Amino acid sequence: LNALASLGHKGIKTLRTFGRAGLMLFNALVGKPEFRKHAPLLVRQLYNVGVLSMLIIVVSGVFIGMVLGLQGYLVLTTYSAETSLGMLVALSLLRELGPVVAALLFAGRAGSALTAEIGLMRATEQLSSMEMMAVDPLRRVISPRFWAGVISLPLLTVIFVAVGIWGGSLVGVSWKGIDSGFFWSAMQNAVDWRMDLVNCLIKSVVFAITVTWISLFNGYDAIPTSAGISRATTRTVVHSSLAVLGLDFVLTALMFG
Amino acid sequence: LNALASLGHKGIKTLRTFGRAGLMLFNALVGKPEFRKHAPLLVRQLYNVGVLSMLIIVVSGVFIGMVLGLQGYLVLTTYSAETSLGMLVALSLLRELGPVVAALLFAGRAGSALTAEIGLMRATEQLSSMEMMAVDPLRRVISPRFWAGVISLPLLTVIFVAVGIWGGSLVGVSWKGIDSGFFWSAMQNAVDWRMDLVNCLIKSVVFAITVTWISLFNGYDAIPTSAGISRATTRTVVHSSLAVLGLDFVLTALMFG
Amino acid sequence: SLSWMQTGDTLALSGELDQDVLLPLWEMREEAVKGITCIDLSRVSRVDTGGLALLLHLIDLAKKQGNNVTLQGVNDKVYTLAKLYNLPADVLPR
Amino acid sequence: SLSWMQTGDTLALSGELDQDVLLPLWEMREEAVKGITCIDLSRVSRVDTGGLALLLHLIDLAKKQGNNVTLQGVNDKVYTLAKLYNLPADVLPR
Amino acid sequence: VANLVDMRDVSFTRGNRCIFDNISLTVPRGKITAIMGPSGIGKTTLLRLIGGQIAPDHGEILFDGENIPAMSRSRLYTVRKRMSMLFQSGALFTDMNVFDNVAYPLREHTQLPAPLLHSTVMMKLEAVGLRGAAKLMPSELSGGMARRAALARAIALEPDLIMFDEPFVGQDPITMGVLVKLISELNSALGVTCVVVSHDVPEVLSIADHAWILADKKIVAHGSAQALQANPDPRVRQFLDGIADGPVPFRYPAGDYHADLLP
Amino acid sequence: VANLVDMRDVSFTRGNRCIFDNISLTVPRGKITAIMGPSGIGKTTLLRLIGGQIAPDHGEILFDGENIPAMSRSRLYTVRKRMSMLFQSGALFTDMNVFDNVAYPLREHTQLPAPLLHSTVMMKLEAVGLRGAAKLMPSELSGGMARRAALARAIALEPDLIMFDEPFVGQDPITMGVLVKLISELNSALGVTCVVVSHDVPEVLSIADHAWILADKKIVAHGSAQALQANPDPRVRQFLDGIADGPVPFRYPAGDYHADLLP
Ligand SMILES: CCCCCCCC/C=C/CCCCCCCC(=O)O[C@H](COC(=O)CCCCCCCCCCCCCCC)COP(=O)(O)OC[C@@H](O)CO
Ligand SMILES: CCCCCCCC/C=C/CCCCCCCC(=O)O[C@H](COC(=O)CCCCCCCCCCCCCCC)COP(=O)(O)OC[C@@H](O)CO
Ligand SMILES: CCCCCCCC/C=C/CCCCCCCC(=O)O[C@H](COC(=O)CCCCCCCCCCCCCCC)COP(=O)(O)OC[C@@H](O)CO
Ligand SMILES: CCCCCCCC/C=C/CCCCCCCC(=O)O[C@H](COC(=O)CCCCCCCCCCCCCCC)COP(=O)(O)OC[C@@H](O)CO
Ligand SMILES: CCCCCCCC/C=C/CCCCCCCC(=O)O[C@H](COC(=O)CCCCCCCCCCCCCCC)COP(=O)(O)OC[C@@H](O)CO
Ligand SMILES: CCCCCCCC/C=C/CCCCCCCC(=O)O[C@H](COC(=O)CCCCCCCCCCCCCCC)COP(=O)(O)OC[C@@H](O)CO
Ligand SMILES: CCCCCCCC/C=C\CCCCCCCC(=O)O[C@H](COC(=O)CCCCCCCCCCCCCCC)COP(=O)(O)OC[C@@H](O)CO
Ligand SMILES: CCCCCCCC/C=C\CCCCCCCC(=O)O[C@H](COC(=O)CCCCCCCCCCCCCCC)COP(=O)(O)OC[C@@H](O)CO
Ligand SMILES: CCCCCCCC/C=C\CCCCCCCC(=O)O[C@H](COC(=O)CCCCCCCCCCCCCCC)COP(=O)(O)OC[C@@H](O)CO
Ligand SMILES: CCCCCCCC/C=C\CCCCCCCC(=O)O[C@H](COC(=O)CCCCCCCCCCCCCCC)COP(=O)(O)OC[C@@H](O)CO
């Protein structure tokens, strides 16, 4: 049939897109450490990825914690359990909202800016002129941006959870008048260091590897035109959000199932 | 002081950016109806905005409903209340997750593709060559894309809630073994048409006006270079996500407070 | 400003062959090229590409139901347009 | 392959003024231009831009602590590079 | 009026950079007028003053006797049907294949049937030599031919004035030879007044009847082709010959040596 | 070896389109060699075969006697220090102001102190006339001058071969006159072998010693400048003069009339 041959044609060129992505990350992270040449390159990329993402993370964390504090108050006040609001807000952020929503906003703001940057460096032949100076662009361009994304999303997640807990107490204690001794002490003996704090960090490291690898590859593999770069920037947001939400279900069934 | 004069300088040019955005939407939507010329233009834009966004909406809705069904099962099974899982899943989607998460994915996929499209039409002088043929580009280009975004985000939200409820029952009934007569009947007398179904549609229309207006203006006001278009595409995702989450708190305090 | 009057076998046009005033003469086809053998065209002011395409459709109609059709009276600027648009000799004679 | 030997007031260089073999002669400054009045340079093979910049720094050092410094023995291809790089007459004599 | 376009004494500013202090130029009817100059002077802004886009700061632009900056919006749209503009990109819409690009102004301001619209667009596409390319999309057009397809769109409404914005730029000698043949043919037939803005001196001077050289913000020279190859001005002779050094210096304005050479 | 570059019998394919069937060309040492041809033939791929980028399908490229496609990765990186390439964009890094662009290969393969690196870059920036522009960023560079700043970066490691990829394209006559003066000066001094790929015929032939014309996928003509302006081939004469019609037809391959003219 002429339909089965076209489906197997797209199934072959999907296999060698996964193979091109495995060769790009392997040749970027392996060989000849160079701790002194790459240390100024890491600090500049840690500004573009991490510092420039703090506005969308701090402002979104306060609003999300305030919605959680308002919506969880109306549920718990039926059963006279509204002193357990701090346990509800902190646990629903350390699982499933701190890791996930900070990864979806990292993929839209820093993941789009990384695909657009690398695809612009191939449209202006900057990566080909680095190979002519006998400098490997996979070690010099790709790998400082990889480690800047793996470092900065775990650091942005812990800021998201901190200002989200503060926004939840801002509704519960300050506006609704829950006793603040009951609010904070019910939270402190419900949050465990192993089941809650460590499992929040494992999720945000798995998400940081996935979002950064997808975002760096879609710029490196883009068609170097002004319309082909914009098509690859949209492809990062779709592939990162389907992979964050898909991996979030598998890690929820493992850690808390 | 030389700092107060620079702050008032940025406070003036922020006022006339809000004024340029109000003039762009007013001159696009007002005057000489033209129902026959714009009806083929609406159907093509309803493909780019609506049909091409169905993959990120259907796949994300199933995963989010499955995480809600798994995480809400472990809470309710302590108090022997696990037949109320369908009430918990449906109400937490009709408020605060159906409207919000479908608007954040609409802003990343369709909002980025609308800023990139219009800014490319100014970089190649297509909007200036339409004014030379005595065709107003605000009525011919901007306004069919506005109504396609206001129509398609309420339609994508109701698909998100439908496949999210199905994914929640897929965990509760099929995997965990809750009685399916108890599951569905507890949902049906908890969901009201006015407090839940109508309030879901009001939120997704307010979000559809805001996301589309931000996304169309940032392409129309972009600096028409290959680096200035990519800067405006990132600006859409930040401004839409801070406005969706900010308006979500104000509408939650009104509707359910 | 475009009117046509028939004298048996001539279809003497008069006025201007602009694009806007040709909708009467377009929607009077097969009723004006009945027994026409010649198109006079000596009393037209100027002609553009929209009017020249109507002239190609009248000669095509008056050939399929009849003879080879002749012309006269042209302005010798209808011939510069047929030079530019590269029209073959069988769709516009001489 | 670049060695230097001093004969009181001459700093006769020998070898090649490439970019790589100049780190000894760079880190022996103020110790080789003590009482130098003339730089011989008649026994150098070829010179590039990195070696020519070292030559500008020796004449600058041997002028601030002493006389005006003369040269000889050049290859007349050090003068085509000073023509291209537009060097003024006070930083490279004659 | 013998002059179709008549800029009286025009000034323009972009933020705080001054372009065109007090220029004055006339475009005769039926002739090809060239405007040449260096490659950063912003001379594509000159076609946007004539076209009824961004207003001047001080001056008077007359299209056939009527002032374009002092003109209503509805009066501007019916005057803009008399002039056309060919942009440097060949500004084609990126959907709508080459037939639908040429037929776009003919479906907007005309009442023609579906025949006589098929015949009109096929005649316009043949005058530029792209009748076989009628079903290709503009992304497959090999952009020397995108300027020819956007020239068939420009002659669709039979204008009086076509403004060309750098037709010969980055183009091969065969492609430049085609475009010189087309501008000469559309001026012999159809009597169109052409205004060409460029910095390709030997191609433009082979067709122009009157050139205007815009070296600084003034209008420092004008004349015919033979009367410009005998002008003795130093600023004019550097541009028309391609001298590396002159009143536009080869060296950037720098400091001195012996402070960066020997810091 | 008298020939620095020697392509024996090279073939290349991009997917299923064939470029360069069986070409053969030599680059003499110390001379300027031109490669000219039409504007869609993919002749910038010719500089990527020489540069040790994408491999041919069948052939032999010899850089000073050594085969580049049959060469190790570590052998390729130490040979690539002998050749340089100037891209059409002037491929400058978009951070790192003009001083840091020129000094970038000198901080990578050299051991020079912080003096003698300041003096070397200031001498290289003066040979192209941009010593005053040493602190500007490349976004402020007015891209005729971005090709001059990327020429100072190319002569930093003192190469044996510089490959120019369309130096004169979309450029003003004064800017083309500067670049012709610089390629002539860097060949008189420094003895560099230059390979220029272009389609600007009168500028390139004023400096080239041997030209090669690539009309179809073959290498249809070569010779000196005077020996090419007397060649009688029809494909050669259309390119060198700019004839609108010839073996490359002005009309697209179309159907016939009387089916779209009168459908
Ligand atoms: C004699 C007469 C007798 C009369 C007696 C009458 C009265 C008797 C009862 C009264 C009512 C009892 C009130 C109950 C109040 C307590 C309710 C409460 O605190 O729930 C906590 C919520 O945390 C939770 O996991 C819920 C946390 C996660 C929430 C899920 C995230 C929400 C969003 C989904 C993500 C979408 C994807 C991301 C979006 C893009 C569970 O913490 P927990 O204590 O269990 O400890 C943790 C460990 O044990 C796991 O359970
Ligand atoms: C592809 C490119 C690769 C780039 C790699 C990038 C960097 C990779 C990680 C960086 C730091 C990770 C921070 C995570 C901190 C959490 C580490 C941690 O302590 O968790 C332990 C389990 O971890 C676990 O299940 C295993 C979970 C940790 C894995 C999370 C990252 C997954 C990918 C990691 C791949 C590399 C790993 C190489 C290892 C050979 C729990 O034991 P713990 O003492 O607390 O009490 C045990 C008690 O319950 C009974 O004794
Ligand atoms: C320590 C723990 C380590 C665990 C390790 C587990 C390993 C997890 C692997 C992740 C791979 C992520 C790779 C990225 C794949 C992202 C998926 C994807 O590419 O998206 C679409 C397909 O979606 C799809 O069919 C649906 C795609 C699925 C999304 C990926 C899910 C990740 C795994 C979750 C599975 C849960 C199963 C639960 C079973 C109960 C493509 O369509 P589309 O042409 O429009 O493109 C747009 C453009 O081409 C428009 O022309
Ligand atoms: C004699 C001896 C006596 C012994 C007696 C002993 C036992 C006695 C009690 C036992 C325990 C009782 C079990 C309680 C089970 C019932 C729990 C339940 O169903 O909760 C529903 C959850 O819906 C809800 O609003 C919660 C819905 C919204 C959830 C919030 C969204 C989560 C995420 C946040 C968004 C972030 C931004 C978006 C992320 C980017 C509330 O529905 P409800 O019925 O109230 O009707 C709606 C209206 O009345 C408003 O409340
Ligand atoms: C800027 C460009 C503007 C473009 C405009 C784009 C399109 C604008 C709307 C389209 C359709 C909206 C669908 C909304 C459907 C919901 C409409 C609806 O029925 O809701 C009513 C309230 O609404 C309300 O609070 C008011 C809420 C509805 C507003 C939601 C959209 C906000 C912006 C709307 C602006 C235009 C409005 C022009 C009106 C003059 C409730 O009463 P209901 O009978 O159920 O029982 C009452 C019972 O409780 C006692 O009698
Ligand atoms: C029927 C109901 C109708 C209700 C109607 C209510 C009206 C609601 C108005 C929404 C306006 C939305 C306009 C979009 C504004 C989006 C805000 C924004 O622009 O983002 C940043 C500022 O954020 C900020 O300071 C914080 C910005 C606030 C975000 C906007 C919130 C919307 C209103 C929520 C307020 C809740 C108050 C609750 C009080 C208890 C800009 O920084 P930044 O230079 O990096 O730019 C990036 C680039 O320039 C990098 O160089
Ligand atoms: C720390 C540990 C955690 C690490 C987590 C690791 C996860 C991250 C790894 C790699 C991602 C890097 C990027 C990989 C490539 C990005 C995903 C990809 O393959 O791209 C397209 C998706 O195809 C698509 O239909 C999506 C196709 C399906 C995606 C595969 C689903 C996930 C794997 C389930 C197996 C299914 C097998 C069948 C099930 C039995 C294929 O382009 P296509 O051909 O259209 O060409 C046209 C044009 O779009 C580009 O050529
Ligand atoms: C409910 C909210 C809770 C409180 C929230 C408080 C607000 C959020 C706090 C911290 C996040 C700030 C992150 C710090 C970012 C600092 C990093 C930075 O400087 O970024 C530059 C500007 O960034 C910037 O957009 C400047 C960032 C501005 C931060 C937004 C302040 C808005 C305040 C007025 C809004 C009125 C609304 C109503 C308020 C009552 C970008 O240039 P770039 O590096 O490329 O080059 C350099 C050259 O261009 C900069 O001159
Ligand atoms: C259906 C009903 C619901 C409809 C909902 C309506 C909501 C949607 C309306 C308009 C959005 C359309 C786009 C408007 C413009 C987008 C937002 C905007 O103003 O842009 C930048 C944000 O400035 C910024 O610092 C963000 C500045 C603050 C944003 C204002 C917060 C929201 C309003 C709170 C008032 C605060 C006053 C003080 C509090 C007392 C300013 O660019 P800037 O100058 O940097 O130039 C440099 C370069 O970035 C562009 O020139
Ligand atoms: C848990 C999941 C729950 C079930 C989820 C089921 C999957 C999701 C269902 C419906 C959404 C599909 C939306 C339909 C989109 C149809 C619209 C469409 O045709 O879009 C074109 C392709 O789109 C496309 O990426 C083709 C879309 C492909 C849809 C993805 C199917 C992946 C199946 C294999 C994955 C293996 C993973 C493991 C599975 C066991 C884009 O071209 P464009 O219009 O510009 O021009 C035309 C010319 O280019 C097209 O030839």
Author numbering:
A (entry chain A), B (entry chain D): 3 to 259
C (entry chain F), D (entry chain C): 4 to 97
E (entry chain E), F (entry chain B): 5 to 267
What did the article's authors report about this structure?
The structure of nucleotide-free MlaFEDB at 2.9 Å resolution shows the detailed interactions between individual protein components and bound phospholipids. The final map of the MlaFEDB complex at 2.9 Å resolution reveals all side-chain densities and most secondary structural elements. Clearly defined diacyl phospholipids were observed to bind in the cavities of the MlaFEDB complex, and are located in three distinct regions formed by MlaE and MlaD, namely the central, lower and outer cavities. Two phospholipid molecules bound inside of the TMDs are located in the central hydrophobic cavity, which is formed by the TM1, TM2, and TM5 of two MlaE subunits and the hexameric ring of MlaD. The positively charged Lys53 and Arg55 in MlaD, together with the Arg97 and Arg196 in MlaE, form close contacts with the head group of the bound phospholipids. Notably, one acyl chain extends toward the MlaD and the other acyl chain extends deep into the hydrophobic cavity in MlaE, likely representing an intermediate state of the phospholipid being transported. Three phospholipids were resolved in the lower cavity formed by the TM1′, TM2′, TM3′, TM4, TM5 and EH of MlaE and three MlaD TMs. Another two phospholipid molecules were observed in the outer cavity on the surface of MlaE. The nearby TMs form a V-shaped open groove (middle), which may represent a gateway for phospholipid entry and/or exit. The observation of phospholipids in the nucleotide-free structure also suggests that the phospholipids can enter the inner cavity independent of ATP.
